[PDB]
Symmetry: C2
Subunit: 700 residues, 2 copies
């Protein structure tokens, strides 16, 4: 029955790829070759290969012929490590499939569902019958041979996962080293982040206190130190000024007559008739804006500087080594962490005392857990709202009857779908924002935390609220006296197959639609053209109208690694999912290679820091796999424990060993590559000219 | 057991204290005021506790009037942190006892055991009776008020232990900072321990490789790098030469005529007739030993140096901030750790590759767990040996039959107890030796690991003994029932000894005194040997810390279950404070510095004991129908969170020293050649 959904998705993919080819030949930049060459010297630009008389297979050929070195030269290293993630998991699934075929033979040999266990489907229920349900779950009797669909297969998949995870982890460390050593002077090797300075200068100013306290430690090694400020006000004034300047440029571009823009379009004003001569109206607004900004800047740099600062050593060695050293015999003072990118640290979030971060961490996590548990509770009320049918208030009265007889059968269920999907759409941004308040400097750290929270959300959503009951809002009272893990294990063993069919359908769905839209970029194309017909009419505005943005590693890796957990946790239960996971990760490799090589542009560096988290969670997913297989084989009577338990211990040991052998190589950079080959003399002022906040820039 | 154990403890403690006051009058060193005064310029030279007009309470007054700063100025900071541990535990017991008094009242009100729950004494539980069993288990009805044996007392315990652990932890951090600041030029703030130098000198020598690599990283801040060496053979030669030199020192006691001591006397010979003029026999023996040492030392110091080294920077800042960093872009090479004290690092176990350390750790942990489980398995057969009755082959047979009916039947039971004593005596050394195998440089680290191992052993042995009335496939598994009761019986006997006898003997030091006097009467005649005959020995935290924390675990585990035992814990720790103050102020002298690093290892485990308290109390209130959640669930999570809060706020101040407190005010120019002469091994001393 899932063949219908699979066919619908396949048709969607065909339509979207046809649209891509039908559009790629056009003179467009929000599509096939895109913004990235357009700003990078027309490097990846649609040259004679993608120019006139282009190959319909040109994008596929160019993507498949690239190299990891070429990608890391074009885009950031993090893109390379993401591609390594896809490659290594694809290899894992490929070798599992290479061992798959033996498992298929017992699927058609043993015939539990075929044999007398039907009893008319218990005469009161239904479930595993789809002409492939027989071939899935292996339908083995309670004590048959079952060796292949048991400990042997999980041993094989665990060993291959260990081997590829290790090799990929080593390869990512090698890319980190190679890209870190052969770099230029970027303003990170010259700075640190001290952000728990003791507040009182007992009769002095904060900056002098930082200067004294670090001049006592490192003589003859400093440019000078920058202290953080309550920048909120000047930031606000600064976006006011930037918007005023943009609107002035917007007004200036008419070049035909004096423009008069009313205030009704903005909405937060009523000077609609005062639009007259708006082209100069901004000038005094800017004049007032620039005067206020200058006054606030001059006032803020001496008054109420906060208890946190960056520092600037004069040699890469001192900077890269001081950021890992305790600066007080007490720990709650002068906390030091390696400085982040100028474009990746969070001034607003920074300056948070250690205890405040500790409290924020636990309350934010508790809030996330409470939201996950109580998720559907408001949704039920929202669905119950009378919004179902509001025909009584139809003012236009254009075509009332035509919509209430034919299509009304589906919109009634679609409104709860709307209420669900709106929260789904808001969820990534909300999780990102919640991760911000944990204190979390180095925005990439916030992205990683958001990825972790979204992955936990997604697994505890799908695997639970799909397979078993999700509401429990009356049941939670009873579960206080609920029995032990035996009932949960039996429930897993019973409910795995139908959920396996459902996840087959869901992987088909997500695969088809997601990769179709991503490869097409049809939605951003529509937005671009619509805005261009709309507001975008000057060259400055239109250029900003097709900024692609980063890979959004915040929300991509959670989905991909969720589908990884799907691939594992049922890997030998329903060997069908293996081919679907392989095709998902393969097409993901292809499409993401084409995209990240031709459209996307990173906004971080992260120098491969994302990988250890990915490996940690891949291994945790395999651990969940192997525990579930232990339980399932505990149900189907066999030699469970002495088979599975040792390799569960092995998975834990493998995690510890991999951590101990490489994780230390991702936190700090090094001292070797921190001293190696400084040829050009470092600059002094042009280092502040990076970490100075954008708003607080114009100053003596 | 209570009456007999109490009587034995009181009698023996009275006897040993009487012996102390009786023996302290004589001018004996390894006793009341001891070698510890005797060596330090006679600074604490035997005073009114031994001088004219002694007072039996002089030691008590001196101990009570001492100050922590005085101890630190006299003995190492580690003694101060051990005392603050004792004081903190005493304070927790004191607050718990101040809240104890109400809790006893409902125990006298409800008499569950007395009433219908007896059902003809239940036919399944008896033992020694003292009418105080009527207070045990709190004997409350299954669903009465019961708050006293509940959330009230447990919450009070948790609050007082949180407050005390936190305040003490801050106090130890303060002591560490203050002592670490006011220091001198000690060759610890000037070095690191890099011990994963990669294999290849690739056409060169290892020392040149190290020197070039560190000169690339650290220009102008480097003395030179002492590389590790395979000290086995040269260490053996050096100790043999030292023994020969000591034997030569025996000769200057000539005083009658040429000394003549046989080679068979030492044991590794059989020819007595080689006594002739040992004065000369040892000279060319030393001369040959000197030549062999010179050859071996010149060889190993220049040939095939192993893969590990130490470094020496020319500024406390650079050294103390390098040991905390990471050198190579991958961590499996050039591992860097803060250098140990010269006397506290293990050249033997040093130079172990990271994989070998990670595998050895797991193997030794699994082996010690296997021992912790299989403890009784050998002992059953050892008891089963013919040793049970050897009257058949007794050749002398002077008068055994007279005792085999009076008291030797009890000796038939102490023979298995003899087997147990052998294992118990060997166990601390065995655990230390095992911990010395995980790779574990920085001997203090080995002592920490051995203390943890001993503590986990003691818990999972005693508690398994006393879970609940402990006292083809079948003939191996049923031996546990036969073997187990003796383990529990003698371990309770041994902790009963620990309450009183252990402190009594350690304070009196009868055994050290008798060993000293036996050695004095023995061949020891020269002043050097007798002076070295009464080395006091270190504080031995390797066996005192886990025993004390064992009795702490016992104190908590049945604290509110049996509020009676809390006074037993508090009196134990209170008397222990006095005994340890008197000893470590007047006899002991540490062989560490450790600058207070012991304390985290103790705090992490006091919290574990509290956590297991909370778990056990939740379980006990499970059976005793009650609000089994309110008293524990929002508080076990509290303990687990408190662990994180303590760690993430104070842990760092113990692992590393400082930059701020390790940069300030080195007055004179620190010497370079005066640092190697400390890290040079005692074998490779004489050289170019």
């Amino acid at each position: 029955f899932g063949s219908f959904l699979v066919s619908l998705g396949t048709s969607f993919v065909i339509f979207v790829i046809l649209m891509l080819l039908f559009t790629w030949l056009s003179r467009k930049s929000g599509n096939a070759p895109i913004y990235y060459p357009n700003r990078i010297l027309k490097g990846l630009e649609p040259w004679e290969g993608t120019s006139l008389t282009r190959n319909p297979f040109a994008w596929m050929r160019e993507a498949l012929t690239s190299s990891e070195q070429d990608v890391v030269n074009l885009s950031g290293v993090d893109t390379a490590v993401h591609f390594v993630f896809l490659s290594t998991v694809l290899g894992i699934f490929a070798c599992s499939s290479l061992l798959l075929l033996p498992t298929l033979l017992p699927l058609a040999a043993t015939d539990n569902n075929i044999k007398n266990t039907k009893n008319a489907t218990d005469t009161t229920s239904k479930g595993t019958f789809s002409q492939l349900d027989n071939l899935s779950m292996a339908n083995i009797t309670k004590k048959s041979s079952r060796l292949w669909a048991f400990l042997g297969a999980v041993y094989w998949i665990s060993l291959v996962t260990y081997f590829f995870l290790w090799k990929a982890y080593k390869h990512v460390s090698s890319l980190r080293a190679q890209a870190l050593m052969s770099a230029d002077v970027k303003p990170e090797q010259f700075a640190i982040l001290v952000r728990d300075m003791p507040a009182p200068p007992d009769g002095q100013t904060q900056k002098e206190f930082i200067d004294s306290y670090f001049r006592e430690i490192y003589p003859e090694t400093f440019y000078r130190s920058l202290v953080a400020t309550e920048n909120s006000k000047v930031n606000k004034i600064w976006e006011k000024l930037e918007g005023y300047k943009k609107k002035l440029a917007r007004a200036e571009a008419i070049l035909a007559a004096t423009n008069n823009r009313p205030t009704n379009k903005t909405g937060f004003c009523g000077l609609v008739g005062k639009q007259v001569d708006s082209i100069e109206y901004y000038t005094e607004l800017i004049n007032e804006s620039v005067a206020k900004l200058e006054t606030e800047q001059k006032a803020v740099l001496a008054e109420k500087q906060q208890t946190a600062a960056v520092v600037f050593f004069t040699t890469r060695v001192a900077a890269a080594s001081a950021a890992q050293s305790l600066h007080c015999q007490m720990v709650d003072k002068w906390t030091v962490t390696e400085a982040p990118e100028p474009r990746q640290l969070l001034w607003q979030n920074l300056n948070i005392k250690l205890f405040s971060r500790i409290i924020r961490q636990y309350f934010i996590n508790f809030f996330v857990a409470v939201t996950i548990l109580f998720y559907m509770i408001p949704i039920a009320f929202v669905s119950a709202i009378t919004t179902l049918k509001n025909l009584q208030r139809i003012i236009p009265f254009i075509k009332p009857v035509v919509e209430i007889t034919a299509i009304r059968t589906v919109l009634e269920s679609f409104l709860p779908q709307i209420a669900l999907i709106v929260f789904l759409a808001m969820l990534p941004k909300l999780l990102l924002f919640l991760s911000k308040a944990e204190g979390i400097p180095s925005q990439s750290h916030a992205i990683r935390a958001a990825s972790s929270k979204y992955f936990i959300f997604s697994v505890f959503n799908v695997f639970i609220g799909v397979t078993l009951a999700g509401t429990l809002f009356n049941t939670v009272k009873d579960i206080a006296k609920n029995p032990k893990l035996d009932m949960i294990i039996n429930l897993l063993a019973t409910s795995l197959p139908k959920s396996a069919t459902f996840f087959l359908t869901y992987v088909a769905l997500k695969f088809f639609i997601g990769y179709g839209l991503e490869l097409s970029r049809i939605i951003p194309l529509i937005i671009f053209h619509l805005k261009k017909k709309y507001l975008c009419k000057t060259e400055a505005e239109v250029k900003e109208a097709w900024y692609p943005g980063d890979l959004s590693y915040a929300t991509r890796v959670p989905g991909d690694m969720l589908i990884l957990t799907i691939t594992f946790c049922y890997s030998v239960i329903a060997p069908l999912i293996l081919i679907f996971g392989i095709t998902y990760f393969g097409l993901g490799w292809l499409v993401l290679r084409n995209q990240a090589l031709k459209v996307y542009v990173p906004s971080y560096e992260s120098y491969g820091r994302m990988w250890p988290h990915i490996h940690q969670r891949i291994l945790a997913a395999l651990f969940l796999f192997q525990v579930v297989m232990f339980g399932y084989l505990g149900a189907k009577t066999f030699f469970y424990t002495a088979l599975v338990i040792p390799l569960i211990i092995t998975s834990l040991i493998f995690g510890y060993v991999c951590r101990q052998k490489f994780y230390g190589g991702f936190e700090h950079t090094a001292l070797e590559v921190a001293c190696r080959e400084l040829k050009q003399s470092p600059d002094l002022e042009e280092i502040f000219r990076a970490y100075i906040p954008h708003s607080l820039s114009s100053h003596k």
